Design an enzyme around this catalytic site. Structure first.
Site, short mmCIF file in Angstrom:
data_model
loop_
_atom_site.label_atom_id
_atom_site.label_comp_id
_atom_site.label_asym_id
_atom_site.label_seq_id
_atom_site.Cartn_x
_atom_site.Cartn_y
_atom_site.Cartn_z
N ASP A 106 0.84 -1.21 0.00
CA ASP A 106 0.00 0.00 0.00
C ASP A 106 0.88 1.27 0.00
O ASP A 106 1.75 1.39 -0.86
CB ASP A 106 -0.99 -0.05 1.18
CG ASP A 106 -2.08 1.01 1.09
OD1 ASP A 106 -3.10 0.79 0.40
OD2 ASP A 106 -1.92 2.07 1.74
N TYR A 155 -1.72 11.47 1.79
CA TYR A 155 -2.56 11.57 0.59
C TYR A 155 -2.65 13.00 0.07
O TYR A 155 -2.85 13.23 -1.13
CB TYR A 155 -3.98 11.06 0.88
CG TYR A 155 -4.07 9.56 1.10
CD1 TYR A 155 -4.36 8.70 0.05
CD2 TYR A 155 -3.87 9.02 2.37
CE1 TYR A 155 -4.45 7.33 0.26
CE2 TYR A 155 -3.95 7.66 2.58
CZ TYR A 155 -4.24 6.81 1.52
OH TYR A 155 -4.32 5.45 1.72
N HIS A 189 -7.15 -6.91 -0.39
CA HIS A 189 -6.11 -5.87 -0.33
C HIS A 189 -4.82 -6.26 0.40
O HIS A 189 -3.74 -5.71 0.11
CB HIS A 189 -6.69 -4.62 0.33
CG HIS A 189 -5.73 -3.47 0.39
ND1 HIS A 189 -5.28 -2.82 -0.74
CD2 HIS A 189 -5.15 -2.84 1.44
CE1 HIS A 189 -4.45 -1.85 -0.39
NE2 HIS A 189 -4.36 -1.84 0.93
#
Length: 286
Positions: free
Chosen positions: A96, A202, A266
Site C-alpha cells: 500500500d 494523501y 487488499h
C-alpha cells in the site's frame, strides 16, 4: 521487542525479531507494523525481521505540517532506518503506502535493496498508466480525492474510529483473519497514532490535475527500469488496486515474478499468511 530509532528528525517505532540479514517491512494505510505479524514469526529464524511504524502511525512521532509527509522525507526515513539498524542493504517487503514509498526507494537507492517483495499497492509507472486510462482504477481511487476533504478526519475518528473499523476491522473479523487481540492492537494503534498524519500522506499526492496525471511516475524518478530481483504477491479481489496494475510490469522490472491470490483482497500478507509465506520462501531461495 518494541523500540525506537531516531532518523531524519523523528523518532520511529518498530517491531524487531530474529537475526541475520535485514528484512524490513513497510505497511500502508490504515495499518501499522502489526499487519506483518505472520511474516515476522515465520522469517525471524533466518532473518532479522523489522517492521516499521511509518511516521504519523501508532507509536511513531507525528510531526506537524504537510511537508513532513512528502515522498522525499519518507524515502529518507527508509534510508536512515536501514543504516541506523546497522545495515547497508536489506530485503524490502512493502504494501500500500509502504509500496508507494518502497518502490520509489528501490528505484532511487537500488544498492540498499537486495530484493524487493511487493504486495498490493502502486508501481510508480504502471499506476499512473492505469489512473490515466483505466476507468475501473479511476473509480477505485476516487477515495484519494475525497481524502483531500476536511470531513474525512472526523469520518475516520468519530465514534471509536468507526470509519477505520468499517474499513479494516469489520471485514477482518467477519472473514476470520483478525483475532480479538488483533482488533485490540489495531484500536490501540489508532488511539496512539494520528489520523491527521495518516491523511497528510494523501494530501501531497500529485494525481489530480491534467498536468500531474501526465507524469510518467507517481513520484519523480530518473530511471524507468529497476534491475533487482522482485516478487509481487497480489490479492486479486482488492477493490483499491485493479489487476491491470500488473500488466507489462516486466518492462519496468525485468527480473520479476508475480503470484496472484484468487481468494485474497487488499492485504494477502495477513489474509492468507501460509500461501504468502511459501511464495516468499520460494522467491528468496530461487
Amino acid at each position: 521487542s518494541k523500540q525506537y530509532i531516531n532518523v531524519n528528525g523523528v523518532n520511529l517505532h518498530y517491531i524487531s525479531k530474529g537475526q541475520g540479514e535485514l528484512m524490513l517491512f513497510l505497511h500502508g494505510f490504515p495499518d501499522f507494523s502489526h499487519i506483518w505479524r505472520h511474516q515476522i514469526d515465520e522469517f525471524s529464524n533466518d532473518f532479522h525481521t523489522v517492521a516499521l511504524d511509518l511516521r504519523g502511525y501508532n507509536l511513531s512521532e507525528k510531526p506537524s505540517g504537510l511537508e513532513s509527509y512528502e515522498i522525499d522525507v519518507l524515502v529518507e526515513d527508509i534510508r536512515q532506518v536501514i543504516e541506523g539498524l546497522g545495515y547497508s542493504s536489506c530485503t524490502l517487503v512493502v504494501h500500500d503506502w509502504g509500496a508507494g514509498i518502497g518502490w520509489t526507494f528501490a528505484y532511487r537507492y537500488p544498492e540498499y535493496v537486495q530484493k524487493l517483495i511487493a504486495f498490493n499497492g502502486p508501481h510508480p509507472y504502471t499506476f499512473m498508466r492505469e489512473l490515466r486510462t483505466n476507468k475501473n482504477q479511476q473509480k477505485a481511487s476516487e477515495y484519494a480525492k475525497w481524502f483531500q476533504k476536511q470531513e474525512v478526519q472526523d469520518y475516520m475518528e468519530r465514534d471509536n474510529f468507526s470509519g477505520l473499523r468499517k474499513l479494516v476491522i469489520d471485514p477482518g473479523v467477519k472473514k476470520g483473519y483478525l483475532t480479538a487481540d488483533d482488533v485490540q492492537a489495531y484500536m490501540n494503534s489508532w488511539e496512539n497514532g494520528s489520523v491527521l498524519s495518516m491523511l497528510s500522506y494523501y494530501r501531497n499526492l500529485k494525481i489530480f490535475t491534467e498536468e500531474d496525471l501526465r507524469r510518467k511516475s507517481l513520484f519523480p524518478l530518473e530511471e524507468e527500469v529497476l534491475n533487482i530481483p522482485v516478487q509481487i504477491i497480489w490479492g486479486n479481489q482488492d477493490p483499491t488496486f485493479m489487476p491491470e496494475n500488473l500488466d507489462g510490469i516486466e518492462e519496468y522490472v525485468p527480473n520479476i515474478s508475480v503470484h496472484r491470490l484468487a481468494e485474497a483482497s487488499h492485504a494477502p500478507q495477513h489474509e492468507k499468511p501460509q500461501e504468502v509465506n511459501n511464495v516468499m520462501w520460494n522467491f528468496l531461495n530461487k
